[PDB]
Each structure stands twice: as C-alpha cells, then as structure tokens.
Amino acid sequence: VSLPRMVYPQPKVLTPCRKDVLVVTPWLAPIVWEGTFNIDILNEQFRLQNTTIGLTVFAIKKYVAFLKLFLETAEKHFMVGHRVHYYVFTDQPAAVPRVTLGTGRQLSVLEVCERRFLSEVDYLVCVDVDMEFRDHVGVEILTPLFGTLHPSFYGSSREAFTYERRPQSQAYIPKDEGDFYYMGAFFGGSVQEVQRLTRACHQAMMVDQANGIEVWHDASHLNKYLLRHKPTKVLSPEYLWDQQLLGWPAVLRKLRFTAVP
Ligand SMILES: [Hg+2]
Ligand SMILES: [Hg+2]
Ligand SMILES: [Hg+2]
Ligand SMILES: [Hg+2]
Ligand SMILES: [Hg+2]
C-alpha cells in the first residue's frame, strides 16, 4: 500500500549526513548508523505490513538473573509501536520474572519451533540476555538477513579478526578473506533466512565435531555463513556495545544495546 503524505527535511544528494563512517557495504547493503535513517518513514512502511518481530533469548542457569532488566528495557526501546513476540528459552521457567508488557507484545517461555516461528512472526532477532537496551532499536534493522559489527573489531584489519583459522574446520576463513567481524549474537532476518542460517551452522558444527574439532564456536560459524551469504543490512556497533570496556567514542552518536556488568 501507498505511504500517506508526510513532511520531513529533504534529503540532500550532495550533502551526506555521515562522512565519518562507511554507510553501505560493497554489495550495497546499508550499514545502520544514527543519521542514516528517518524512523518515521520506516515505521510507516513496517506498520502498513502489520510486521511482527520475534525476539529470542537463551537464559540458562545464572543467566535467568538478567531477564528482568533485559525485558524491562526492551519494553522501553525495542520495536515500540510494532508487534513483538518474546521467546525465552530457559531451564528455569518459574524463575522468569513477571514483567509488564505493552499492548501487542507477548512473551512465551520455552523450557529447555521451526514451523511455529514461520506462522507467528515475520522476522526473528537473536540476542544475548546479559544485555540492556539504552536507546532506540527499531524497524531500521529489519531485512532478510542481518548481522552486527563486533565492537572490539570494527576498526581492525581482517588479519586481526578472530575467525576460525584452522583449515580442517568448516568455519575456516583464510587470512586474505573477510568483509567484517560480526558478533555471534545480535543477528536476525526473515524467519526463512534465520532458519537457513541456523540449519547451516548446526550442520557445520556436526561435521567439525565428527572431525574432532571444536575458536569462538557460534561466532566463527556465523562469520563463515555471513561471508558466503552476504547480509542485506549490517548493524553498526551502536547496536552491540560495552561502555565499561570500550568507552563512548565520538563515532557512536547513540549506545542502543549494551553489556551489563
Ligand atoms: Hg543522511
Ligand atoms: Hg534465534
Ligand atoms: Hg537466540
Ligand atoms: Hg554457518
Ligand atoms: Hg551460526
């Protein structure tokens, strides 16, 4: 359907807002930074499709302790205005805190789903639970397949990336290959694309197991997948930061989703 009439500042062809960072990859995927998007336009586009976002987190053992802060801050900052379905995978269903949710937002507790996700949500986002939302994380991220720049490596040359470097591993990436180092958390996309990815990772993990090989497990396989199946958006480190470890450098105008000491 058509967008309604909207009044906003004219984009200026000969005046980019961000001259300090790369905002598009060499395969023409946007790299999402503050100042690259008009959230009003994006919100309209996604609400006209009645978009439902699934947010998946694993909270096992001591990590259940992070759920309250995670969910309360997600209520304040994550996809506000859109339909959200939280999926909490946990070994302690009775320890999941009762957090009050906005309208159109639901939570499911799964005790520790393929067809279920296909029928319940349009996008899936996969994050770590020991995190909090500090600022807007919205529909600007949504796309068939996305990953997030690792905050420790976004300025590094690829030789420094801690990819899997053993050729015997399915996740092997040689020193002369690599676009980016993606964090092995905060990835997502359409349900179909996220299922393809997770299927691929699980198959490759089995093969490495069978060959007696186990560096960064989920992150090394993710990085191999995203090297071979290029993401359709890349999230800047605004979306995955640790202020205690890394500070607040000028290049980050917002710190949206961060580590919790
Ligand atoms: Hg801009
Ligand atoms: Hg997921
Ligand atoms: Hg997940
Ligand atoms: Hg993979
Ligand atoms: Hg993976």
Curated annotation (Swiss-Prot):
UDP-N-acetyl-alpha-D-galactosamine binds at residues 58-60, 63, 128-130. It is found in: Golgi apparatus, Golgi stack membrane; Secreted. It comes from the Eukaryota. Changing residue 140 to D: In allele B106. The active site is at 219 (nucleophile). Mn(2+) binds at residues 128, 130. GO terms for molecular function: antigen binding; fucosylgalactoside 3-alpha-galactosyltransferase activity; glycoprotein-fucosylgalactoside alpha-N-acetylgalactosaminyltransferase activity; manganese ion binding; nucleotide binding. One of its GO terms (cellular component) is Golgi apparatus. Keywords: Blood group antigen, Glycoprotein, Glycosyltransferase, Golgi apparatus, Manganese, Membrane, Metal-binding, Secreted, Signal-anchor, Transferase, Transmembrane, Transmembrane helix. Changing residue 147 to R: In group B transferase; lower-level protein expression and intracellular cytoplasmic mislocation. The soluble form derives from the membrane form by proteolytic processing. The keyword Nuclease does not apply. Binds 1 Mn(2+) ion per subunit. One of its GO terms (biological process) is carbohydrate metabolic process. Its cofactor is Mn(2+). Its EC number is 2.4.1.40, 2.4.1.37. An alpha-L-fucosyl-(1->2)-beta-D-galactosyl derivative binds at residues 150, 162, 219, 242. Expressed at high levels in testis. Also expressed in pancreas, uterus and lung and salivary gland. Residues 1-261 are lumenal. Pathway: Protein modification; protein glycosylation. It is an enzyme of class 2 (transferase). Belongs to the glycosyltransferase 6 family. The conserved DXD motif is involved in cofactor binding. The manganese ion interacts with the beta-phosphate group of UDP and may also have a role in catalysis. This protein is the basis of the ABO blood group system. The histo-blood group ABO involves three carbohydrate antigens: A, B, and H. A, B, and AB individuals express a glycosyltransferase activity that converts the H antigen to the A antigen (by addition of UDP-GalNAc) or to the B antigen (by addition of UDP-Gal), whereas O individuals lack such activity. Glycosyltransferase that catalyzes the transfer of carbohydrates to H antigen, forming the antigenic structures of the ABO blood group. This is Histo-blood group ABO system transferase.
